[PDB]
Design a protein around this ligand. Structure first.
Ligand SMILES: Nc1ncnc2c1ncn2[C@@H]1O[C@H](COP(=O)(O)OP(=O)(O)OP(=O)(O)O)[C@@H](O)[C@H]1O
Ligand SMILES: [Zn+2]
Lengths: 278, 286, 70, 50, 146
């Protein structure tokens, strides 16, 4: 009846086992399970993610052991929070992380167990640092083809997620499926130390530790002189003369600005004499 | 044995997210769990772990319990998904260690020959690269005490892994990287004097406190020994650089020369080419 | 932010790569390159160096999935 | 045109651009191997036969 | 070895599986026993004894050979202008002796792909070491021996 676009709140702790357990299955595809709480129709949260045994014979719906979860939920009771299960996830490192033929067969089984059972995919390969990558989807019922086939209200959270549209075969699965919006509920307490732990460990280890003399400048002078004539022949090549040769051509970069910063490296590193000492 | 450890931000978060678990229900003590190490070599690495319900009474300061039904079967869980991952020890968020911590390691030595404990910090404050690591050995003592079991500090360092920087390094997004060669090295210099000379004053005041009170530590002897290794140059009045004086500017010899030589021709590249392309568009248009 | 965008294009594709054989330069911003398997691939060239190292026939490294000219 | 070189997209497997091919260059290269240019200024003594 | 089973990309071998290969190369022809017997030749009783001996003597009389140091014959050249009834007489002697018969021809060893009939003997004589006679019969040895 009434269906509203869902918003997925992921915890920074749940983001860990998505890429981490997925990295352990690389190259092969894994099968996980999502753990969280259903607040309402238009929003959903995943508060935890745990690792499930990887299948070396290929992913199947029987790869999830029911006594593995029954022993896990009991261990979650003695753990701080015993929250009910919600849905499943699987890695797909070998390709662009789209729902395979097994993923649709385990859909109607998991959506019978739990109401939503959001399908979540993840890939390591698409980037390293500055991209969300991952993936998510939710099955829209094929029996609804008799009814209105274009959910959801509050559109562009889908529509904008429908950008880039990610080639063809991916959105070729937009038949019988619709993706879901992933935003981050603020962990910033942990996220503030995530930046502090990362950059401090990357700043000279104490900031002190790190803080071929003339010879490095004799090797640099070959880049600061012998590179000049191959750079300064181009203005004489800009002289035609004049003018039979196709123009414009700009040879100014990148050596000029590199030798600039090359002195910026050597000047402030030589200031270590004046800085460290006295 | 264990020399240095590698703590990932992922496994350290597994201590931090459990601080939300039992932090809302309270009450006393801290977050404690069992550590799953990855040992490929003498250098120790940690990937994942599992947090276990744990409590330490005050009164009763020596009372501690792990849940070992949680430790046994959940090991067969992580072992089934990851064959390489095994328990190398335990951890906790400290911030400091009560004397009772001697008994936590000796109990679990049945699991691992040497269990390394990792003291972590949920709220970053000071003074630097956070958390901590200890190793369990027996040095006895020189004074003749019965055999003394005291955890020795293990240097901790953060490390990375493939595919784990996807979501981790994404959420910050506010950092400027880096920039190497201009600001990166100089900000360290301003801090190298700060963080270098603050521990200089903190220790020299505690070393003066020795004569006053708190003796032992005598230490002995490690304090003055490496301090005298720092004494290869003091450097005191005035700098004792008579041999390093002409050599001082002689290291700045070519650095200033090239900086004079590069800026001359870089100008010839910048000044000439700018004037050329400028007047070609400027005056030929009008 | 544009200097941060310079780290972006230099980040892609990082590792791994696959060898391929350059055939000819058809037009700007893209060129065709024969794969080591023999199948000629038409790939957008990288925006950094479009000219001097192109050459009529040369062995150029390509990315695994994208086969990108770098 | 037939026999001409064309680019190929991955997804729809269509032709993105048109590329110049070589068919006549194959033959003509073998034709320039056997003989140089040899114009009228490169020939002489046959004037009665030319 | 080879032939062992292994599962998809996991690359684990559960068991080492025999035997050798392949298809018709392993077994050239499967022959149970002919409908005729050695009694079907008239007037040849003089020259069938030499035939019947060399095949029969290594089986039943082998115990007498180790005592006297006798070596059984192996190859026998049976030739005559056709019809000589050679192929009927050969196979018929394998019916009463229980010997398993294998049908093979010389020109059958030539195929488009080089190195076929040559690899067959590597397989054929390997079964001659594995299996006990039985028997193997071939025809047109003169042509193929050119
Ligand atoms: N000397 C013989 N003794 C018994 N039967 C014979 C004789 N000569 C011919 N025959 C009969 O003639 C028929 C023709 O057989 P034939 O001798 O042509 O085979 P073959 O020439 O030995 O075959 P292949 O050429 O393959 O060796 C047979 O059925 C056989 O019974
Ligand atoms: Zn799958």
């Amino acid at each position: 009846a009434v269906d509203t676009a869902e918003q997925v709140y992921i915890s920074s702790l749940a983001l860990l086992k998505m890429l981490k357990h997925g990295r352990a299955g690389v190259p092969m595809e894994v099968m996980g399970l999502m753990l969280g709480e259903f607040v309402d129709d238009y929003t959903v949260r995943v508060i935890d993610v745990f690792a499930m045994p990887q299948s070396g014979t290929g992913v199947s719906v029987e790869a999830v052991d029911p006594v593995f979860q029954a022993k896990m939920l009991d261990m979650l009771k003695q753990t701080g929070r015993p929250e009910m299960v919600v849905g499943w996830y699987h890695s797909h490192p070998g390709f662009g992380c789209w729902l395979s033929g097994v993923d649709i067969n385990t859909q109607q089984s998991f959506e019978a167990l739990s109401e939503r059972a959001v399908a979540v995919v993840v890939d390591p390969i698409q980037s390293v640092k500055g991209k969300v990558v991952i993936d998510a989807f939710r099955l829209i019922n094929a029996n609804m083809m008799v009814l209105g086939h274009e959910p959801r209200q509050t559109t562009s959270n889908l529509g904008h997620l429908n950008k880039p549209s990610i080639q063809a075969l991916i959105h070729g699965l937009n038949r019988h499926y619709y993706s879901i919006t992933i935003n981050y509920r603020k962990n910033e307490l942990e996220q503030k130390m995530l930046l502090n732990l990362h950059k401090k460990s990357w700043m000279e280890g104490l900031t002190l530790q790190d803080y071929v003399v003339k010879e490095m400048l004799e090797l640099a002078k070959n880049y600061n002189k012998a590179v000049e004539e191959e750079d300064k022949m181009t203005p004489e090549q800009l002289a035609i003369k004049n003018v039979g040769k196709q123009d414009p051509k700009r040879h100014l970069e990148e050596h000029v600005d590199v030798l600039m910063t090359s002195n910026i490296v050597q000047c402030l590193a030589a200031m270590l004499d004046t800085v460290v000492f006295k | 044995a264990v020399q240095k450890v590698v703590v990932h931000p992922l496994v350290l978060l597994s201590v931090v997210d459990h601080f939300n678990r039992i932090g809302k229900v309270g009450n006393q003590k801290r977050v404690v769990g069992v550590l799953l190490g990855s040992w490929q070599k003498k250098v120790l690495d940690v990937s994942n772990s599992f947090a276990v319900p744990f409590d330490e009474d005050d009164k009763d300061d020596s009372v501690w319990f792990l849940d070992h039904d949680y430790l046994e079967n959940m090991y067969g869980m992580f072992k089934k998904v990851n064959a390489r991952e095994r328990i190398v020890g335990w951890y906790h968020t400290g911030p400091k260690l009560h004397k009772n911590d001697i008994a936590i390691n000796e109990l679990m030595k049945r699991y691992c020959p040497n269990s390394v404990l990792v003291i972590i910090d949920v709220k970053p404050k000071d003074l630097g690269l956070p958390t901590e690591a200890y190793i369990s050995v027996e040095e006895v003592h020189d004074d003749g005490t019965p055999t003394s079991k005291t955890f020795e500090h293990v240097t901790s360092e953060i490390g990375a892994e493939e595919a784990e920087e996807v979501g981790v390094e994404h959420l910050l997004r506010d950092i400027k990287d880096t920039t190497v060669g201009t600001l990166s090295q100089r900000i360290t210099n301003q801090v190298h004097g700060l963080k270098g000379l603050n521990s200089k004053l903190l220790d020299i005041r505690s070393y003066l406190e020795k004569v006053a009170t708190g003796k032992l530590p005598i230490n002995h002897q490690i304090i003055y020994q490496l301090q005298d290794v720092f004494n290869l140059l003091p450097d005191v009045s005035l700098q004792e650089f008579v041999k390093a004086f002409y050599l001082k500017t002689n290291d700045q010899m070519v650095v200033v020369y090239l900086a004079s030589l590069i800026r001359s021709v870089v100008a010839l590249h910048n000044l000439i080419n700018n004037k050329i392309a400028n007047r070609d568009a400027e005056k030929k248009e009008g | 932010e544009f200097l941060h965008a310079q780290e972006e294009v230099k980040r892609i594709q990082s590792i791994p790569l696959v060898i391929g054989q350059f055939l000819e330069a058809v037009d700007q911003n893209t060129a065709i390159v024969g794969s080591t398997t023999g199948s000629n691939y038409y790939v957008r060239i990288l925006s950094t160096i479009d000219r001097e190292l192109l050459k009529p026939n040369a062995s150029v490294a390509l990315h695994k999935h994208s086969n990108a000219l770098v | 045109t037939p026999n001409c070189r064309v680019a190929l997209r991955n997804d729809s497997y269509t032709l993105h651009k048109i590329l110049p091919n070589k068919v006549d260059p194959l033959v003509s290269l073998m034709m320039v191997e056997k003989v140089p240019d040899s114009t009228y200024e490169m020939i002489g003594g046959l004037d009665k036969q030319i | 070895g080879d032939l062992v089973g292994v599962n998809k990309d996991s690359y684990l071998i559960l068991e080492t599986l025999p035997t050798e290969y392949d298809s018709r190369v392993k077994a050239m022809e499967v022959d149970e026993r002919p409908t005729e017997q050695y009694s079907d030749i008239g007037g040849l009783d003089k020259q069938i004894q030499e035939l019947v001996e060399a095949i029969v003597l290594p089986m039943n009389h082998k115990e007498k050979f180790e005592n006297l140091g006798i070596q059984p014959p192996k190859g026998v050249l049976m030739y005559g202008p056709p019809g000589t009834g050679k192929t009927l007489l050969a196979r018929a002697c394998a019916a009463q002796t229980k010997a398993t018969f294998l049908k093979l021809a010389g020109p059958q060893l030539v195929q488009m792909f080089i190195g076929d009939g040559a690899k067959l003997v590597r397989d054929a004589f390997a079964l001659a070491k594995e299996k006990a006679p039985s028997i193997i019969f071939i025809d047109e040895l003169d042509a193929i021996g050119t």
